[PDB]
Design a protein around this nucleic acid. Structure first.
Lengths: 129, 56, 30, 124, 180, 141
RNA sequence: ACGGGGAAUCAGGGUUCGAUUCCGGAGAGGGAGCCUGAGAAACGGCUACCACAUCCAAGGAAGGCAGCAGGCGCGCAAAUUACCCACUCCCGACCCGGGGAGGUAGUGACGAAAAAUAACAAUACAGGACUCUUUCGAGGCCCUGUAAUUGGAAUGAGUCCACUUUAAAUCCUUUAACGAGGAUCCAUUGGAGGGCAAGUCUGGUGCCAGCAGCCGCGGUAAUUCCAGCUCCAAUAGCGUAUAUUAAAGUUGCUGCAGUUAAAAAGCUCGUAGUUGGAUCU
């Protein structure tokens, strides 16, 4: 059955970006999906999106600027300290100049650079570059 | 499958005594000689890019 | 002795490796 | 040139009644100076007799420049005989070691272990 | 139980491919240019450079204000500029990755004796140092691999007992004088 | 596919440890039966007494008689066949003398022409075969 | 299989090893039982049995090297029956005695570090020519060169002397005498078809002898065997056997595979196990 709705959301965005489509529909929505999307959009990868508020669980329509190479989830959500972050960056990211690892930490959901600035670890959700 | 010929070819090879040649350099001098042969002078080449021990 | 056609009529015989090595030595000698 | 003596890490040890120092010997073109000449030089430098001056552990630097060793000048000769290692005294002819080897002493001890009483004195 | 110390380490690395033509040519070029004895000297300098590069590369992953990065990087840079391998103008951790093997081979006492003019050739410089003719400041140095510091460059004389700088003829000169 | 769960460490470890047995080299080195069947008993070399000289016909494409000797190992009395490497070297080995024997270089596998022989003679009468081959040492008289 | 600190290797992840000098444990031929003592189930303490073994005048007595040397045996596999308590410390009634702990030497290519086996010049000649000229040539205007050419310089391997070292010259260092031209004061170990660096040169053998880790060479020009010459790889070191690490993304957590190459259970149910949709500032 459907576990890890974030995996489905990220896979839908990835498959839609590969096909060149200019919008993608994500369902169901959740707080974690919206936080991950906001982290993407702050760095200018997806752009604006809308949350269709159906009265059981939301849907999202995400616009797709053609800047997203890959977006993925990391499952299971491994707990990542500050020391393991560089190893995770080497494993997941294409370069040291671009691409982010998203973690859920006690200060919220944010990229690896922000977690380094805030001096906190967390659990790795996914990545995008 | 006899064992009677065990040192046949080595036994019947005509012995040739080694020549009396000069001692070769050793250590830093030999490496300097190699460097001079290979990178400093291009005397033996014919422009055809052969090997160091080419007999043709 | 010419490596170019030595390779062209020896690559199936006992001397394939030697003529191939010589031909590559002619091509890029350094 | 000639031999020069300097005393680097001078210290006055009243607890062993001496002055202990590190001796640098400049002998720019000579063999390592004999300990006796260094003792005469130290006696002249410190205005004392060379019979209360014990020098040892002299190492010559690579290249032949100088030598570094340790030296100790005692307040008197009896204080020297009291505070000194027996071998450094024997290097001055003030002490003589026993002649017997370790093996002879050990076998003699084990031989006496097998007798009781004054007969112990009759072994060996 | 002994009072001895078993701490020791190897100072070179044998290459993975034994018969690479380009590697052999480069190593022979280094040996001939700097008058080295074997490939082990090249590999030793390679190993020291590799360890320095490894330390710098590790320190470049730390935060720019990490106190350990500051302390250790400053120490490494000070060491590199002390022996003159690194210019003091380029004293960032990222410039350590720009150093070559020849920068470390340039600081050898053999190369320095050849450069300061005390020897006519690099091999002459080697035989000079090995024959107790060259002193650094006041110390006779027999080791051609002696890496000369910047503060020690200005004092590389010809020894005060060498026939060439000190004034005592050798065995050959004395015997030839005794012949006549 | 493969289980990826935070609490799957036991399953992953047990699966890997069970599957490692299907690896041939690991099973050889860890089962111990191949160590029991090894004539050297895990040793790199072994001394033996030569029982006879034999000539082992080579494999199908080649045509030669390889010189070998049956040797009975001192440590356990197991009989093996050891190839005498160089030419005219079988003339350096007598009956019932003592030889040192090493592996052939393929870890208990036959090497090249010689079928079923996985050892080579290194010494004979306490002198190496190379010292006798090059004339540096003579067999004791 | 003694455990750990740890070791080898390793991009990241790992894989192997750890008898071995530090800490902990255990044993003193195998078991067992004790005395004394603060502390022992002690073995350079005792008692007995078992195994082995010693002296015996056959009545008895006496054993315990997995302490240091040394011997036998085992094996592929490992040093002297040496000197000393001077150092480090420990023990004692003790400033003083003792310590095969420990130190010091002997054997030592386990291994690791530094580092010789030549440098320079004149003289054929070679070439270029970040030098001058109607090809030409002057090429000391720089750099090579089996030249056993010649020439003077340098020096340590070695032998030896006095120091110094040290408990005792037991080396290293220091000074001095002698000490290089084939500087005979003579560098070797593996290779030359490919993998893989470097000869289808010459002589011999002729599917023989042998080589060859693998592919392969050898049945009359053998680029591969046996040799000569030459060449190259590392070099006071190099080859071989075995175990192991990387290579191995061929054990795959990172990170493999399962239509046909090895492989999805005949099918479904189902308990542990694993995983589990949105939502609460």
């Amino acid at each position: 059955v459907r576990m890890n709705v974030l995996a489905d959301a990220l896979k839908s965005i990835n498959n839609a970006e590969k096909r060149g489509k200019r919008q993608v529909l994500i369902r169901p929505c959740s707080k974690v999906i919206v936080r991950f999307l906001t982290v993407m959009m702050k760095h200018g990868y997806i752009g604006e999106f809308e949350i269709i508020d159906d009265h059981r669980a939301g849907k999202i329509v995400v616009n797709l600027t053609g800047r997203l190479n890959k977006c993925g989830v990391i499952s299971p959500r491994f707990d990542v300290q500050l020391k393991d972050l560089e190893k995770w960056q080497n494993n997941l990211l294409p370069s040291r100049q671009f691409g982010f690892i998203v973690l859920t930490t006690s200060a919220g959901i944010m990229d690896h650079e922000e977690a380094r600035r805030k001096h906190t670890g967390g659990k790795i959700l996914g990545f995008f570059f | 499958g006899s064992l009677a010929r065990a040192g046949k070819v080595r036994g019947q090879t005509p012995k040739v005594a080694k020549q009396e040649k000069k001692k070769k350099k050793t250590g830093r001098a030999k490496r300097r000689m190699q460097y001079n042969r290979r990178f400093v002078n291009v005397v033996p080449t014919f422009g055809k890019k052969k090997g160091p021990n080419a007999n043709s | 002795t010419d490596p170019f056609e030595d390779f062209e009529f020896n690559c199936n015989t006992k001397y394939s490796g030697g003529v191939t090595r010589n031909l590559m030595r002619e091509l890029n000698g350094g | 040139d000639t031999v020069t003596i300097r005393t680097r890490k001078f210290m006055t040890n009243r607890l062993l009644q001496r002055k202990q120092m590190v001796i640098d010997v400049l002998h720019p073109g000579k063999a390592t100076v004999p300990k006796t000449e260094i003792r005469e030089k130290l006696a002249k430098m410190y205005k004392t007799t060379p019979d209360v001056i014990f020098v040892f552990g002299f190492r010559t630097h690579f290249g032949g420049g100088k030598t570094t060793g340790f030296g100790m000048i005692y307040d008197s000769l009896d204080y020297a005989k009291k505070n000194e290692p027996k071998h450094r005294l024997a290097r001055h002819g003030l002490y003589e070691k026993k002649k017997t080897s370790r093996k002879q002493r050990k076998e003699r001890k084990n031989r006496m272990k097998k007798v009781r009483g004054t007969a112990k004195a009759n072994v060996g | 139980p002994v009072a001895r110390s078993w701490v020791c380490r190897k100072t070179y690395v044998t290459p993975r491919r034994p018969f690479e033509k380009s590697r052999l040519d480069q190593e022979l070029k280094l040996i001939g240019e700097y008058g080295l004895r074997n490939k082990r000297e090249v590999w030793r300098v390679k190993f020291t450079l590799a360890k320095i590069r490894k330390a710098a590369r590790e320190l470049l992953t730390l935060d720019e204000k990490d106190p350990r990065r500051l302390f250790e990087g400053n120490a490494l840079l000070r060491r590199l500029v002390r022996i003159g391998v690194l210019d003091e103008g380029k004293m960032k951790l990222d410039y350590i990755l720009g150093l070559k093997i020849e920068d470390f081979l340039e600081r050898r006492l053999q190369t320095q004796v050849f450069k300061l003019g005390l020897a006519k050739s690099i091999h002459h410089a080697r035989v000079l140092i090995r024959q107790r003719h060259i002193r650094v400041r006041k110390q006779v140095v027999n080791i051609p691999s002696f890496i000369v510091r910047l503060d020690s460059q200005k004092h590389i004389d010809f020894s005060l007992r060498s026939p060439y700088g000190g004034g005592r003829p050798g065995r050959v000169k004395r015997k030839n004088a005794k012949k006549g | 596919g493969k289980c990826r769960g935070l609490r799957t460490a036991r399953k992953l470890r047990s699966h890997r440890r069970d599957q490692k047995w299907h690896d041939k080299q690991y099973k050889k080195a860890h089962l111990g039966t191949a160590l029991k069947a090894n004539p050297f008993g895990g040793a790199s070399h072994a001394k033996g007494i030569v029982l006879e000289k034999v000539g082992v016909e080579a494999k199908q494409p080649n045509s030669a008689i390889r010189k070998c000797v049956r040797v009975q190992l001192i440590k356990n009395g197991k009989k093996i066949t050891a190839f005498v490497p160089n030419d005219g070297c079988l003339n350096f080995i007598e009956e019932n003398d003592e030889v040192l024997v090493a592996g052939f270089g393929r870890k208990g596998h036959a090497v090249g022409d010689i079928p079923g022989v996985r050892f080579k003679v290194v010494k004979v009468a306490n002198v190496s075969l190379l010292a006798l081959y090059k004339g540096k040492k003579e067999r004791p008289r």
